[PDB]
Write a protein that binds this ligand. Sequence first.
Ligand SMILES: NC(=O)[C@H]1CCCN(C(=O)[C@H](OCC2CCCC2)c2ccccc2)C1
Ligand SMILES: [Zn+2]
Length: 139
Amino acid sequence: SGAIYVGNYRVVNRHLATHNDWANLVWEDSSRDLLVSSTTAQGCDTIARCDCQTGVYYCSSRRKHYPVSFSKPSLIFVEASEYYPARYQSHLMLAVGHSEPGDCGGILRCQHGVVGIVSTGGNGLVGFADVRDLLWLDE
Ligand SMILES: NC(=O)[C@H]1CCCN(C(=O)[C@H](OCC2CCCC2)c2ccccc2)C1
Ligand SMILES: [Zn+2]
C-alpha cells in the first residue's frame, strides 16, 4: 500500500483504490495502473520533472529503502490477476530489485522528488508506474 499527496490530489495504484477514491475520482488509466482522487487537505509531496534513471524506492516487504537504476517509461507485458487481464501496461519502468504483493504503492524518488509508485513485481524485478509526465498534478 501507499499513495502520493500533491496539492488537492491523491495518487494511488488503480487496483488498490478505495470506494472514497472512486467517489472523488479525478482521472484513472487502467493501462497505467493509476488512479487520482481529490482531497480536501493540501498535499506537500513534490513531483519530479526530469529524465533520471537512478533513485531510491521503499520496499515494505523488507522495511527498507533500496537504490536502483530503472528503465525509461515504456509499454511492458503483465500477466492476469484479481485486478487485470494479461495485457501491456504503459508508462512502466523496471529495475532489478525485490517487490512482492503488498509492496505496491511504495514511492520511488530521485533528487528532484517523486518519480513513481511500485506497481509490478516478481522474477527479481520491480516495476514502477511513472507520474513525471502528469504535469497537471502541480496546478
Ligand atoms: N500492475 C499490475 O498489473 C500488477 C497488479 C498486481 C499483480 N502484479 C504483479 O506484477 C505481481 O503480482 C503477481 C505475482 C505473480 C507471482 C507472485 C505474485 C506483483 C505486484 C506487486 C508487487 C510485486 C509483484 C501485476
Ligand atoms: Zn530526477
